[PDB]
Design an enzyme around this catalytic site. Structure first.
Site, PDB file in Angstrom:
ATOM      1  N   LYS A 181      10.446  18.819  -5.761  1.00 26.00           N
ATOM      2  CA  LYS A 181       9.240  17.909  -6.147  1.00 26.00           C
ATOM      3  C   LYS A 181       7.985  18.228  -5.313  1.00 26.00           C
ATOM      4  O   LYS A 181       6.904  18.355  -6.816  1.00 26.00           O
ATOM      5  CB  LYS A 181       9.196  15.999  -5.344  1.00 26.00           C
ATOM      6  CG  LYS A 181      10.357  15.637  -6.194  1.00 26.00           C
ATOM      7  CD  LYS A 181      10.879  13.866  -5.109  1.00 26.00           C
ATOM      8  CE  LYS A 181      11.532  13.391  -5.855  1.00 26.00           C
ATOM      9  NZ  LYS A 181      12.560  13.968  -5.856  1.00 26.00           N
ATOM     10  N   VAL A 209       2.438  -9.153  -0.994  1.00 25.78           N
ATOM     11  CA  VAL A 209       2.119 -10.371  -1.276  1.00 25.78           C
ATOM     12  C   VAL A 209       2.596 -10.341   1.154  1.00 25.78           C
ATOM     13  O   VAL A 209       3.763 -10.621   0.440  1.00 25.78           O
ATOM     14  CB  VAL A 209       2.658 -11.832  -1.180  1.00 25.78           C
ATOM     15  CG1 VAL A 209       2.337 -12.558  -0.912  1.00 25.78           C
ATOM     16  CG2 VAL A 209       2.346 -11.268  -2.752  1.00 25.78           C
ATOM     17  N   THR A 235       5.588  -7.124  -3.172  1.00 28.67           N
ATOM     18  CA  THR A 235       5.908  -7.011  -1.854  1.00 28.67           C
ATOM     19  C   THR A 235       4.559  -7.050  -1.483  1.00 28.67           C
ATOM     20  O   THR A 235       4.748  -6.856   0.102  1.00 28.67           O
ATOM     21  CB  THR A 235       6.673  -6.013  -1.649  1.00 28.67           C
ATOM     22  OG1 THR A 235       6.442  -4.503  -1.920  1.00 28.67           O
ATOM     23  CG2 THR A 235       8.467  -5.746  -1.984  1.00 28.67           C
ATOM     24  N   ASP A 279      -4.809  -6.354  16.129  1.00 24.77           N
ATOM     25  CA  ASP A 279      -3.784  -6.260  17.369  1.00 24.77           C
ATOM     26  C   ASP A 279      -4.011  -6.382  18.765  1.00 24.77           C
ATOM     27  O   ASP A 279      -4.756  -5.749  19.348  1.00 24.77           O
ATOM     28  CB  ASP A 279      -2.065  -4.984  16.738  1.00 24.77           C
ATOM     29  CG  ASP A 279      -2.615  -4.272  15.834  1.00 24.77           C
ATOM     30  OD1 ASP A 279      -1.515  -5.162  15.130  1.00 24.77           O
ATOM     31  OD2 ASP A 279      -2.146  -3.349  14.854  1.00 24.77           O
ATOM     32  N   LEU A 336       8.194  23.003   7.445  1.00 24.37           N
ATOM     33  CA  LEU A 336       8.017  21.201   8.224  1.00 24.37           C
ATOM     34  C   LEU A 336       9.552  20.681   8.232  1.00 24.37           C
ATOM     35  O   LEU A 336      10.704  20.526   7.707  1.00 24.37           O
ATOM     36  CB  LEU A 336       6.738  20.851   7.739  1.00 24.37           C
ATOM     37  CG  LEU A 336       5.302  21.497   7.001  1.00 24.37           C
ATOM     38  CD1 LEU A 336       4.633  20.501   6.735  1.00 24.37           C
ATOM     39  CD2 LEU A 336       5.245  22.736   8.344  1.00 24.37           C
ATOM     40  N   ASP A 364      -2.266 -10.468  14.923  1.00 25.04           N
ATOM     41  CA  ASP A 364      -1.471 -10.631  15.803  1.00 25.04           C
ATOM     42  C   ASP A 364      -1.544  -9.926  16.896  1.00 25.04           C
ATOM     43  O   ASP A 364      -1.807  -8.993  17.622  1.00 25.04           O
ATOM     44  CB  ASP A 364       0.028 -10.001  15.249  1.00 25.04           C
ATOM     45  CG  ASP A 364      -0.212  -8.527  14.737  1.00 25.04           C
ATOM     46  OD1 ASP A 364       0.748  -7.375  15.699  1.00 25.04           O
ATOM     47  OD2 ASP A 364      -0.517  -7.966  13.702  1.00 25.04           O
TER      48      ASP A 364
HETATM   49  N1  LIG Z   1       7.234  -0.717  12.316  1.00 27.35           N
HETATM   50  C1  LIG Z   1       6.676  -0.249  12.981  1.00 27.35           C
HETATM   51  C2  LIG Z   1       5.422  -0.975  13.116  1.00 27.35           C
HETATM   52  C3  LIG Z   1       4.676  -0.928  14.389  1.00 27.35           C
HETATM   53  N2  LIG Z   1       4.605  -0.463  15.074  1.00 27.35           N
HETATM   54  C4  LIG Z   1       3.357  -0.464  16.140  1.00 27.35           C
HETATM   55  C5  LIG Z   1       2.824   0.280  16.140  1.00 27.35           C
HETATM   56  C6  LIG Z   1       1.494  -0.197  15.415  1.00 27.35           C
HETATM   57  O1  LIG Z   1      -0.056   1.213  15.448  1.00 27.35           O
HETATM   58  C7  LIG Z   1       1.628  -1.238  16.612  1.00 27.35           C
HETATM   59  C8  LIG Z   1       0.223  -2.889  15.574  1.00 27.35           C
HETATM   60  O2  LIG Z   1       1.241  -2.215  14.196  1.00 27.35           O
HETATM   61  P1  LIG Z   1       0.488  -2.649  12.637  1.00 27.35           P
HETATM   62  O3  LIG Z   1       0.934  -3.092  11.842  1.00 27.35           O
HETATM   63  O4  LIG Z   1      -0.588  -3.682  12.839  1.00 27.35           O
HETATM   64  C9  LIG Z   1      -0.058  -0.707  11.630  1.00 27.35           C
HETATM   65  P2  LIG Z   1      -1.575   0.075  12.305  1.00 27.35           P
HETATM   66  O5  LIG Z   1      -1.028   1.032  12.996  1.00 27.35           O
HETATM   67  O6  LIG Z   1      -1.745  -0.827  13.743  1.00 27.35           O
HETATM   68  O7  LIG Z   1      -2.066   0.706  11.478  1.00 27.35           O
HETATM   69  P3  LIG Z   1      -3.389  -1.082  10.355  1.00 27.35           P
HETATM   70  O8  LIG Z   1      -2.438  -0.190   9.515  1.00 27.35           O
HETATM   71  O9  LIG Z   1      -5.017   0.030  11.061  1.00 27.35           O
HETATM   72  O10 LIG Z   1      -3.052  -2.164  11.249  1.00 27.35           O
HETATM   73  O11 LIG Z   1       2.809  -1.565  16.085  1.00 27.35           O
HETATM   74  C10 LIG Z   1       6.248  -0.161  15.823  1.00 27.35           C
HETATM   75  O12 LIG Z   1       6.218   0.157  16.584  1.00 27.35           O
HETATM   76  N3  LIG Z   1       6.652  -0.352  14.479  1.00 27.35           N
HETATM   77 MG   LIG Z   2      -0.721  -5.808  13.180  1.00 25.86          MG
HETATM   78 MG   LIG Z   3      -2.665  -3.081  12.916  1.00 28.84          MG
HETATM   79 NA    NA Z   4       4.951  -8.349   1.666  1.00 27.66          NA
HETATM   80 NA    NA Z   5      11.449  21.399   6.701  1.00 30.70          NA
END
Ligand SMILES: Nc1ccn([C@H]2C[C@H](O)[C@@H](COP(=O)(O)CP(=O)(O)OP(=O)(O)O)O2)c(=O)n1
Ligand SMILES: [Mg+2]
Ligand SMILES: [Mg+2]
Ligand code: NA
Ligand code: NA
Ligand SMILES: [Cl-]
Ligand SMILES: [Cl-]
Ligand SMILES: [Cl-]
Ligand SMILES: [Cl-]
EC number: 2.7.7.7
Length: 326
Positions: free
Chosen positions: A63, A94, A92, A183, A53, A247
DNA sequence: CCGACGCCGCATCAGC
DNA sequence: GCTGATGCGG
DNA sequence: GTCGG
């Protein structure tokens, strides 16, 4: 959960590398491996099978063989036993404490929930809220509660101005049976890529949600992004619902499709799609898709009238939100 | 072998 | 105050 | 940690 043991192992490894080693590319390497294994439709029988994969290399294959033979990984067993690593990993969890603050706290001898409470004066505002709602923020949100929250947000936004459009994105829009948070993508015709004809567009929405006691706390707030805390109302004599993270992202109305693609995710899906865009000579953010010039500088925004248009530019078959949970 | 690994908003800090 | 870097998280 | 060229 065909390979839940392996994917759990890789996620704990990713978390170690992010939180403790502060090695963000190993964190993303492990998460990519976890994600490609999670959608593999067979029960993995060997590291060699896994190494076929993309994103599983020699080290993870080794692993997986250790894990399959014994049910355990010595590296993790050692990490779980290490006081400093375990303490940094815990802190972390928190909201607002990342790897840097967690290590700084642990160095100062702040290592437990009780320690954090006694040293609340050493926390910034975001961290104080994350500690206040630590228990609640650990709980998932059943989709049934998401539907109630959606109804409140959409109705309260409509009362402010019927020309707002609010769209719940994230895992909810991917059809998840529970979510970590809510969101909300927001648009208003007065806010486009060409002009901002009204001020306080996000503010007014946040204020209305606070007025009806839905939003309870603010973690961060600017002109286009709000991060905070909300709570469903409960009935007489009934236990209160957990407080939840919410958010909100206000996106220029003419850039809605790039914005809803971004906010729908998943995070790993966005990383993979944006990496594929680059290979195809494009760059995607939450506002635009732009071609890359011969030197690799982003050109002018390309016309976009649907999510599918973005997939078409990079020569991907369209994927519905429910198939984006990578 | 090795560079590249998605892209960005808000809070906070250093340096001026 | 402003700009730029960094932490954190979306 | 993985991979493409
Ligand atoms: N490092 C990142 C983090 C988030 N995003 C985008 C894609 C994500 O689905 C949306 C809400 O994030 P969230 O942090 O709310 C994660 P989500 O997909 O809504 O799942 P839950 O745990 O049920 O909330 O923000 C991104 O592009 N890059
Ligand atoms: Mg969010
Ligand atoms: Mg979310
Ligand atoms: Na944190
Ligand atoms: Na591979
Ligand atoms: Cl790294
Ligand atoms: Cl283990
Ligand atoms: Cl768009
Ligand atoms: Cl842009």
């Amino acid at each position: 959960t065909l390979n839940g043991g392996i994917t759990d192992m890789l996620t704990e490894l990713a978390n170690f590398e992010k939180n403790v080693s502060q090695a963000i590319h190993k964190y993303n390497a492990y998460r990519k491996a976890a994600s490609v294994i999670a959608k593999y439709p067979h029960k993995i029988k060997s590291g060699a099978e896994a190494k076929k994969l993309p994103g599983v290399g020699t080290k993870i294959a080794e692993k997986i063989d250790e894990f399959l033979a014994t049910g355990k990984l010595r590296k993790l067993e050692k990490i779980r036993q290490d006081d400093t690593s375990s303490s940094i990993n815990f802190l972390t969890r928190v909201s607002g404490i990342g790897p840097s603050a967690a290590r700084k706290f642990v160095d100062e001898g702040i290592k437990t929930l009780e320690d954090l409470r006694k040293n609340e004066d050493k926390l910034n505002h975001h961290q104080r809220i994350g500690l206040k709602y630590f228990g609640d923020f650990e709980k998932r949100i059943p989709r049934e509660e998401m539907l109630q929250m959606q109804d409140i947000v959409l109705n309260e936004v409509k009362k402010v101005d019927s020309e707002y459009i609010a769209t719940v994105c994230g895992s909810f829009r991917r059809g998840a049976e529970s979510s970590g948070d809510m969101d909300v993508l927001l648009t208003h015709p007065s806010f486009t890529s060409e002009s901002t004809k009204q001020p306080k567009l996000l503010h007014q929405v946040v204020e209305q949600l606070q007025k009806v006691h839905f939003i309870t706390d603010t973690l961060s707030k600017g002109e286009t992004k709000f991060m905070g805390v909300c709570q469903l109302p409960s009935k007489n004599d009934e236990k209160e619902y957990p407080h939840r993270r919410i958010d909100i992202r206000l996106i220029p109305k003419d850039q809605y499709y790039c914005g809803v693609l971004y906010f729908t995710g998943s995070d790993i899906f966005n990383k993979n799609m944006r990496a594929h865009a680059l290979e195809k000579g494009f760059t995607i953010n939450e506002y635009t898709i732009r071609p890359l010039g011969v030197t690799g500088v982003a050109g002018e925004p390309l016309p976009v009238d649907s999510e599918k248009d973005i997939f078409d530019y990079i020569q991907w078959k369209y994927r519905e939100p429910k198939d984006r949970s990578e």
